[PDB]
Design a protein around this ligand. Structure first.
Ligand SMILES: CCCCCCCC/C=C\CCCCCCCC(=O)OC[C@H](O)CO
Ligand SMILES: CCCCCCCC/C=C\CCCCCCCC(=O)OC[C@H](O)CO
Ligand SMILES: CCCCCCCCCCCCCCC
Ligand SMILES: CCCCCCCCCCCCCCC
Ligand SMILES: CCCCCCCCCCCCCCC
Ligand SMILES: CCCCCCCCCCCCCCC
Ligand SMILES: CCCCCCCCCCCCCCC
Ligand code: NA
Ligand code: NA
Ligand SMILES: [Sr+2]
Length: 294
C-alpha cells in the first residue's frame, strides 16, 4: 500500500503544479472579462476556492466534536498564508500596494482584530453568524470598489481553465495528503498530531501553490488578494461554520500572532512595500511560530 502511496503523492504534486498555473491563468482572464482588478478576483473566486478545504475541515471537525481542530486549522491557515505563503511570494515578486488596495487591507486588519476580540471567550454560534455576515459584506464591498464593468467564446475557455485549474489543485492537494498518509502508514511512521498538523498543512497547499504561480507571473495583486481573502474566508467562513456546530475554544495566542502579522502586513502596505526584506520577516516569523506554537 506504500506503492500507491508514492503514486498518489507526486501525481497530486503534479496536479498541484500545473493546476495552480491554470487556476491563475483562468482567474486572470476572468478578471479582465468582468473588468475587475486581479486583487478582486484573487480575494473572491480564488480565495474562496482555495479555502474550501478549511471550510469542509472546520465543519467536519466541529461536527465530530473536535472544535479545537476546527479553530486550530482556521487560524493556523491565516498565520500560514501571511507568514509562509505571502512571505515566499513577496520575495519572488515584490509588491507596491496602491491606495485602493491599502484600504482593503485596513478593513482586513479591523476584521481580524474584531474576530480576536469577540474570540477571547471563544467562538459561539452568534460569533459565527456575525463573522459570516461581515464576510459577505467584505466580498460585496471588495467587488464594487474593484469592478468597473461597462459591458459565447473567449469567456468559455477562460472559465474552463479556471474550473479545471481549481479541480486540479483541490484534487492535487487531496492526493498529496492521501499519498503521504499511506507512506506513513505502510512504514508504520503514522503519528497523528503529525497526521493532523499535516492535514492542517495540506489544507493550505492550494493557497501556497496558487500564490507561487501568480508570483512567478508577477501578479502581485492577485497574490495579495488571495492571501487577504483566504484569511477572511477561513475566519468568516471556516471558523464561522465550525462555531455553528459547536462552541470553538479560545485561541488567544494564535490570534495575537495573527493580529500582529496582519498589523505588520498593513503597515508595510501603507508606508513601505511588500518586497524581499518584508517577505524575509514574514518567513522568519513563520519559522518562529511553527517552532514555538502548538
Ligand atoms: C476593531 C473593532 C473591535 C470591536 C470589538 C467589539 C467587541 C464587542 C464585545 O466585546 O462583544 C462581547 C462579545 O460578544 C462577548 O462574547
Ligand atoms: C493516516 C491514517 C488514517 C487517517 C487518514 C486520514 C486521511 C484524510 C485525507 C483527506 C480527506 O479525505 O479528508 C479528510 C477527512 O478527515 C477524511 O474523513
Ligand atoms: C521521474 C519519476 C516519475 C515522475 C512522474 C511520476 C508520475 C506518477 C503517476 C502515478 C499515478 C498513480 C496512479 C495510482 C492509481
Ligand atoms: C515541501 C512541502 C512539504 C514541507 C512544508 C512546506 C515547505 C515549503 C514548500 C514551498 C512550496
Ligand atoms: C531580516 C528582516 C529585515 C526586515 C526589514 C523590514 C523593514 C524594511 C524597511 C521597511
Ligand atoms: C533572492 C532571494 C533571497 C531569499 C532570501 C530568504 C531569506 C530568509 C529565509 C528564511 C529565514 C528564516 C530565519
Ligand atoms: C524575527 C524575530 C522576531 C522577534 C519578536 C518581535 C518581532 C517584531 C516584528 C516587527 C518588528
Ligand atoms: Na483560500
Ligand atoms: Na486552503
Ligand atoms: Sr465569544
Amino acid at each position: 500500500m506504500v506503492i500507491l502511496g508514492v503514486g498518489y503523492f507526486l501525481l497530486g504534486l503534479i496536479l498541484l503544479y500545473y493546476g495552480s498555473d491554470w487556476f491563475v491563468l483562468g482567474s486572470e482572464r476572468i478578471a479582465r472579462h468582468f473588468n475587475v482588478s486581479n486583487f478582486v478576483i484573487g480575494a473572491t473566486v480564488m480565495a474562496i476556492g482555495t479555502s474550501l478545504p478549511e471550510i469542509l475541515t472546520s465543519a467536519y471537525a466541529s461536527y465530530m466534536h473536535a472544535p479545537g481542530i476546527s479553530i486550530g486549522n482556521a487560524i493556523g491557515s491565516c498565520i500560514c498564508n501571511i507568514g509562509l505563503v505571502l512571505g515566499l511570494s513577496a520575495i519572488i515578486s515584490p509588491i507596491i500596494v496602491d491606495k485602493n488596495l491599502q484600504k482593503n487591507i485596513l478593513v482586513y486588519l479591523l476584521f481580524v482584530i474584531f474576530a480576536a476580540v469577540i474570540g477571547i471567550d471563544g467562538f459561539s454560534w452568534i460569533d459565527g453568524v456575525v463573522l459570516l455576515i461581515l464576510f459577505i459584506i467584505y466580498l460585496r464591498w471588495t467587488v464594487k470598489n474593484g469592478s468597473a464593468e461597462i459591458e459565447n467564446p473567449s469567456v468559455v475557455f477562460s472559465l474552463v481553465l479556471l474550473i479545471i485549474g481549481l479541480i486540479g489543485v483541490l484534487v492535487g492537494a487531496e492526493l498529496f495528503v492521501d499519498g503521504a498518509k499511506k507512506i506513513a502508514l505502510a512504514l508504520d511512521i503514522s503519528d497523528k498530531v503529525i497526521g493532523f498538523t499535516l492535514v492542517a498543512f495540506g489544507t493550505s497547499l492550494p493557497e501556497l501553490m496558487v500564490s507561487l504561480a501568480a508570483a512567478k507571473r508577477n501578479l502581485g495583486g492577485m497574490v495579495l488578494g488571495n492571501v487577504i481573502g483566504s484569511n477572511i474566508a477561513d475566519i468568516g467562513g471556516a471558523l464561522a461554520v465550525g462555531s455553528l456546530f459547536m462552541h470553538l475554544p479560545a485561541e488567544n495566542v494564535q490570534m495575537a500572532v495573527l493580529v500582529i502579522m496582519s498589523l505588520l502586513l498593513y503597515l508595510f502596505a501603507k508606508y513601505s512595500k511588500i518586497g524581499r526584506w518584508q517577505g524575509i520577516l514574514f518567513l522568519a516569523l513563520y519559522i518562529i511560530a511553527i517552532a514555538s506554537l502548538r
